[PDB]
Design an enzyme around this catalytic site. Structure first.
Site, PDB file in Angstrom:
ATOM      1  N   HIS A   1      -7.927  -1.261 -33.304  1.00  0.00           N
ATOM      2  CA  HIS A   1      -7.519  -1.233 -34.704  1.00  0.00           C
ATOM      3  C   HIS A   1      -8.095  -2.380 -35.524  1.00  0.00           C
ATOM      4  O   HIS A   1      -8.693  -2.155 -36.572  1.00  0.00           O
ATOM      5  CB  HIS A   1      -5.996  -1.203 -34.830  1.00  0.00           C
ATOM      6  CG  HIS A   1      -5.514  -1.191 -36.247  1.00  0.00           C
ATOM      7  ND1 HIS A   1      -5.562  -0.066 -37.039  1.00  0.00           N
ATOM      8  CD2 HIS A   1      -4.982  -2.170 -37.020  1.00  0.00           C
ATOM      9  CE1 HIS A   1      -5.079  -0.350 -38.237  1.00  0.00           C
ATOM     10  NE2 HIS A   1      -4.720  -1.620 -38.250  1.00  0.00           N
TER      11      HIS A   1
ATOM     12  N   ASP B   1      -6.946   4.377 -40.291  1.00  0.00           N
ATOM     13  CA  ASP B   1      -5.592   4.350 -40.817  1.00  0.00           C
ATOM     14  C   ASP B   1      -5.236   5.656 -41.514  1.00  0.00           C
ATOM     15  O   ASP B   1      -6.032   6.188 -42.286  1.00  0.00           O
ATOM     16  CB  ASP B   1      -5.422   3.166 -41.773  1.00  0.00           C
ATOM     17  CG  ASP B   1      -5.520   1.834 -41.065  1.00  0.00           C
ATOM     18  OD1 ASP B   1      -6.002   1.814 -39.910  1.00  0.00           O
ATOM     19  OD2 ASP B   1      -5.107   0.817 -41.657  1.00  0.00           O
TER      20      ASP B   1
ATOM     21  N   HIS C   1      -8.161  -0.752 -39.924  1.00  0.00           N
ATOM     22  CA  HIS C   1      -7.405  -1.922 -40.377  1.00  0.00           C
ATOM     23  C   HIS C   1      -7.673  -2.339 -41.831  1.00  0.00           C
ATOM     24  O   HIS C   1      -6.812  -2.934 -42.483  1.00  0.00           O
ATOM     25  CB  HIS C   1      -7.672  -3.096 -39.428  1.00  0.00           C
ATOM     26  CG  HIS C   1      -6.683  -4.214 -39.539  1.00  0.00           C
ATOM     27  ND1 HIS C   1      -5.325  -4.002 -39.644  1.00  0.00           N
ATOM     28  CD2 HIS C   1      -6.853  -5.557 -39.518  1.00  0.00           C
ATOM     29  CE1 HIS C   1      -4.704  -5.166 -39.707  1.00  0.00           C
ATOM     30  NE2 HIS C   1      -5.609  -6.126 -39.630  1.00  0.00           N
TER      31      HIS C   1
ATOM     32  N   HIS D   1      -1.629   5.936 -42.446  1.00  0.00           N
ATOM     33  CA  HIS D   1      -0.555   5.373 -43.263  1.00  0.00           C
ATOM     34  C   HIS D   1       0.276   6.392 -44.044  1.00  0.00           C
ATOM     35  O   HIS D   1       0.332   6.348 -45.278  1.00  0.00           O
ATOM     36  CB  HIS D   1      -1.098   4.297 -44.206  1.00  0.00           C
ATOM     37  CG  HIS D   1      -1.308   2.973 -43.543  1.00  0.00           C
ATOM     38  ND1 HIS D   1      -0.269   2.136 -43.209  1.00  0.00           N
ATOM     39  CD2 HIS D   1      -2.439   2.344 -43.140  1.00  0.00           C
ATOM     40  CE1 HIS D   1      -0.745   1.048 -42.633  1.00  0.00           C
ATOM     41  NE2 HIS D   1      -2.062   1.151 -42.580  1.00  0.00           N
TER      42      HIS D   1
ATOM     43  N   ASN E   1      -1.558  -2.378 -36.188  1.00  0.00           N
ATOM     44  CA  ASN E   1      -0.604  -3.461 -36.414  1.00  0.00           C
ATOM     45  C   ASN E   1       0.706  -2.947 -36.978  1.00  0.00           C
ATOM     46  O   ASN E   1       1.745  -3.565 -36.785  1.00  0.00           O
ATOM     47  CB  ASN E   1      -1.184  -4.598 -37.283  1.00  0.00           C
ATOM     48  CG  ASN E   1      -1.890  -4.101 -38.535  1.00  0.00           C
ATOM     49  OD1 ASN E   1      -2.787  -3.261 -38.469  1.00  0.00           O
ATOM     50  ND2 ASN E   1      -1.505  -4.647 -39.686  1.00  0.00           N
ATOM     51  N   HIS E   2       0.658  -1.804 -37.655  1.00  0.00           N
ATOM     52  CA  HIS E   2       1.862  -1.200 -38.222  1.00  0.00           C
ATOM     53  C   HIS E   2       2.671  -0.371 -37.208  1.00  0.00           C
ATOM     54  O   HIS E   2       3.693   0.218 -37.550  1.00  0.00           O
ATOM     55  CB  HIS E   2       1.513  -0.352 -39.442  1.00  0.00           C
ATOM     56  CG  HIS E   2       1.256  -1.155 -40.673  1.00  0.00           C
ATOM     57  ND1 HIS E   2       2.260  -1.526 -41.539  1.00  0.00           N
ATOM     58  CD2 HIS E   2       0.110  -1.673 -41.179  1.00  0.00           C
ATOM     59  CE1 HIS E   2       1.744  -2.231 -42.530  1.00  0.00           C
ATOM     60  NE2 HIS E   2       0.440  -2.335 -42.335  1.00  0.00           N
TER      61      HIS E   2
ATOM     62  N   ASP F   1       4.047   3.859 -42.419  1.00  0.00           N
ATOM     63  CA  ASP F   1       4.125   2.822 -43.447  1.00  0.00           C
ATOM     64  C   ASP F   1       3.299   3.135 -44.681  1.00  0.00           C
ATOM     65  O   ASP F   1       2.230   3.730 -44.598  1.00  0.00           O
ATOM     66  CB  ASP F   1       3.737   1.447 -42.893  1.00  0.00           C
ATOM     67  CG  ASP F   1       4.874   0.775 -42.153  1.00  0.00           C
ATOM     68  OD1 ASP F   1       6.040   1.196 -42.326  1.00  0.00           O
ATOM     69  OD2 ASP F   1       4.598  -0.182 -41.401  1.00  0.00           O
ATOM     70  N   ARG F   2       3.831   2.723 -45.827  1.00  0.00           N
ATOM     71  CA  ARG F   2       3.175   2.854 -47.128  1.00  0.00           C
ATOM     72  C   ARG F   2       3.058   4.284 -47.655  1.00  0.00           C
ATOM     73  O   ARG F   2       3.469   4.562 -48.779  1.00  0.00           O
ATOM     74  CB  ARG F   2       1.840   2.099 -47.164  1.00  0.00           C
ATOM     75  CG  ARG F   2       2.022   0.621 -47.510  1.00  0.00           C
ATOM     76  CD  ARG F   2       0.711  -0.076 -47.827  1.00  0.00           C
ATOM     77  NE  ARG F   2       0.098  -0.644 -46.634  1.00  0.00           N
ATOM     78  CZ  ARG F   2       0.295  -1.891 -46.217  1.00  0.00           C
ATOM     79  NH1 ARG F   2       1.091  -2.701 -46.908  1.00  0.00           N
ATOM     80  NH2 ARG F   2      -0.302  -2.330 -45.113  1.00  0.00           N
TER      81      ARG F   2
ATOM     82  N   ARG G   1      -4.883 -12.824 -43.978  1.00  0.00           N
ATOM     83  CA  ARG G   1      -3.635 -12.104 -43.749  1.00  0.00           C
ATOM     84  C   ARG G   1      -2.504 -13.037 -43.355  1.00  0.00           C
ATOM     85  O   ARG G   1      -1.340 -12.684 -43.467  1.00  0.00           O
ATOM     86  CB  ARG G   1      -3.796 -11.036 -42.673  1.00  0.00           C
ATOM     87  CG  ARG G   1      -4.604  -9.840 -43.103  1.00  0.00           C
ATOM     88  CD  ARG G   1      -4.728  -8.866 -41.961  1.00  0.00           C
ATOM     89  NE  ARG G   1      -5.933  -8.061 -42.069  1.00  0.00           N
ATOM     90  CZ  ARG G   1      -5.960  -6.835 -42.571  1.00  0.00           C
ATOM     91  NH1 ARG G   1      -4.838  -6.279 -43.005  1.00  0.00           N
ATOM     92  NH2 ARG G   1      -7.102  -6.167 -42.632  1.00  0.00           N
TER      93      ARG G   1
ATOM     94  N   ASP H   1      -2.233   2.474 -37.079  1.00  0.00           N
ATOM     95  CA  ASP H   1      -1.703   2.513 -38.448  1.00  0.00           C
ATOM     96  C   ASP H   1      -1.363   3.932 -38.911  1.00  0.00           C
ATOM     97  O   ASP H   1      -1.980   4.468 -39.831  1.00  0.00           O
ATOM     98  CB  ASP H   1      -2.640   1.821 -39.443  1.00  0.00           C
ATOM     99  CG  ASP H   1      -2.382   0.327 -39.554  1.00  0.00           C
ATOM    100  OD1 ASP H   1      -1.546  -0.199 -38.787  1.00  0.00           O
ATOM    101  OD2 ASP H   1      -3.020  -0.322 -40.413  1.00  0.00           O
TER     102      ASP H   1
HETATM  103 CL   LIG Z   1      -2.949  -3.453 -43.287  1.00  0.00          CL
HETATM  104 MN   LIG Z   2      -3.867  -2.379 -40.381  1.00  0.00          MN
HETATM  105 MN   LIG Z   3      -3.570  -0.536 -42.679  1.00  0.00          MN
END
Ligand SMILES: [Cl-]
Ligand SMILES: [Mn+2]
Ligand SMILES: [Mn+2]
Ligand SMILES: [Cl-]
Ligand SMILES: [Mn+2]
Ligand SMILES: [Mn+2]
Lengths: 7, 294, 294
Positions: free
Chosen positions: B167, B58, B242, B60, B118-119, B89-90, B215, B86
């Site tokens: 991932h 990730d 992940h 991110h 997943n993002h 995001d964030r 999750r 990933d």
């Molecule tokens: Cl996550």
């Molecule tokens: Mn993830």
């Molecule tokens: Mn992540």
């Protein structure tokens, strides 16, 4: 020539 | 599409205070999206790579840490790369991050590979700050364009027929390695089923078999599932991201699986380090670490 | 299913410090879910009610404000009720809220009605604090049960063939009032299409026709769309929630549409009041207001 890991 | 110019303006902020934006034109970005989207489709949904190559988890949105990450393992095409999804995001700078990555995917389509986290899905893009970033710096339409590019990303990669990469992790439905290849793109990331699990699932020491995922989506699998799978397909390793890990890499099922996380201080709430897995032609894996900051 | 006992323990905390939990057994809650889920299905997806009745918008987990809301307009079956969705998420006590509501839906299936807000969906339930609430107080499985109950909720209601009600608003695809009735339950809330728009869309003064929605999903419509619609179906009002308003009620398209929001201080970040629309048999609508706190 195959899979192993370091440290 | 002036690819070199784009990469140039992007790499330019290399070491110039934390969080110095790089504002491409929305037209340049569409180029990156469409001409890479082309590449993703012409390439298999289940990649088959070969060492040597560096692997990353990730990112991110933490763009300056992605720079250090290349600064440490070598900018392309010096090193071959596999990223485990990933990307946005964030973080603070998802735009620069995903752009630099989509750019290198176009420049070196054969020495640079990107999987789907997943993002990389409009279902969570909107929420965790990527859609907001677009809306703030560009416009809604553009974000709608990324999600047409993500929908065409590869799901998994098998390095040298020994390492299997994705991932999230394994799935109760992943029995035939062809089930992955049968997946048609472009496609959204579902709530259930194989594709979902491949991006959501997790390892769990305490779980035996297939347990519920904290999750609220997909499952969790145990060390038995790992071994029984590595044995059914003659694989020696599972590489996935992940999940945040303190050291950047973390073993599970007794080194039968490793977790890679490349973003130091995931949100400034971790003080964790970032890792990247060097894999020479012999399959001798090492872990270059990007320490945080004290 | 001991319905009366359940309602009893729920109403018991009426005025007893802010945020005193009421912990039913997970078995009681499943009862509420399954026996109401039954009711929702046997009833039409597009309800047809008649005055008098009170109408309410978003409650979003603020349970003690839901109490004041009954305390003000009268607990059932004293008053008939239509709720416009968004029952859980963000608030502190989604569990008590949705339980009290599912309970009254079972006790008085004919004097109490619930529609489906955008937050009655596992896609956002998970994120905005409802799935977390379940996970904390009960378990994942139970939350998975709510989303099987929500998936069977009514989408819209038409009071006295004059007022048309739904959580979000109108849709470019809503031309035939039958398109709503053709919707099969149980069902998830999609990204596009009629059903989605019915729960996501918004009014916009500045918009002419159908514009992009700042939410990143569905559209926004203008005052023209409202009038042209109220005229195509011989309706005199559109009642919806979905959006915070300072006074609790807010007019649009020159009173051709009203927005209802029943949760004071939506997150303690608004100081807004909550409203509820009293509708006597003559269609004389009044707005009982639940002031916040200064
Ligand atoms: Cl996550
Ligand atoms: Mn993830
Ligand atoms: Mn992540
Ligand atoms: Cl909302
Ligand atoms: Mn809403
Ligand atoms: Mn709401």
């Amino acid at each position: 020539k195959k899979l192993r890991f370091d440290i | 599409l002036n690819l070199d110019s784009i990469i140039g303006r992007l790499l330019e902020v290399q070491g110039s205070r934390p969080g110095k934006n790089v504002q491409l034109t929305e037209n340049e970005i569409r180029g990156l999206c469409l001409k890479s989207r082309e590449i993703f489709l012409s390439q298999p949904i289940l990649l088959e790579l070969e060492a040597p190559l560096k692997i990353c988890g990730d990112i991110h949105g933490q763009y300056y840490d992605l720079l250090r990450l290349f600064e440490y393992g070598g900018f392309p095409p010096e090193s071959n790369y596999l990223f485990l999804g990933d990307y946005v995001d964030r973080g603070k700078q998802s735009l620069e991050t995903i752009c630099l990555l989509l750019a290198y995917k176009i420049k070196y389509p054969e020495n640079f590979f990107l999987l789907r986290g997943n993002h990389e899905c409009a279902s969570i893009n909107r929420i965790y700050g990527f859609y907001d970033e677009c809306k703030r710096r560009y416009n809604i339409k553009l974000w709608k364009t990324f999600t047409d590019c993500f929908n065409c990303l590869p799901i998994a990669a098998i390095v040298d027929e020994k390492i299997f990469c994705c991932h999230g992790g394994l799935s109760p439905d992943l029995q035939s390695m062809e089930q992955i290849r049968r997946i048609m793109r472009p496609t959204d990331v579902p709530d259930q089923g194989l594709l979902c699990d491949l991006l959501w699932s997790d390892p769990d020491k305490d779980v035996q078999g297939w347990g519920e995922n904290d999750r609220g989506v997909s499952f969790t699998f145990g060390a038995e599932v790992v071994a029984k799978f590595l044995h059914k397909h003659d694989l020696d390793l599972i590489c996935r991201a992940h999940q945040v890990v303190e050291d950047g890499y973390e073993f599970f099922a007794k080194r039968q699986l490793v977790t890679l996380f490349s973003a130091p201080n995931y949100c400034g709430e971790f003080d964790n380090a970032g890792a990247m897995m060097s894999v020479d032609e012999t399959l001798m894996c090492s872990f270059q670490i990007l320490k945080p900051a004290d």
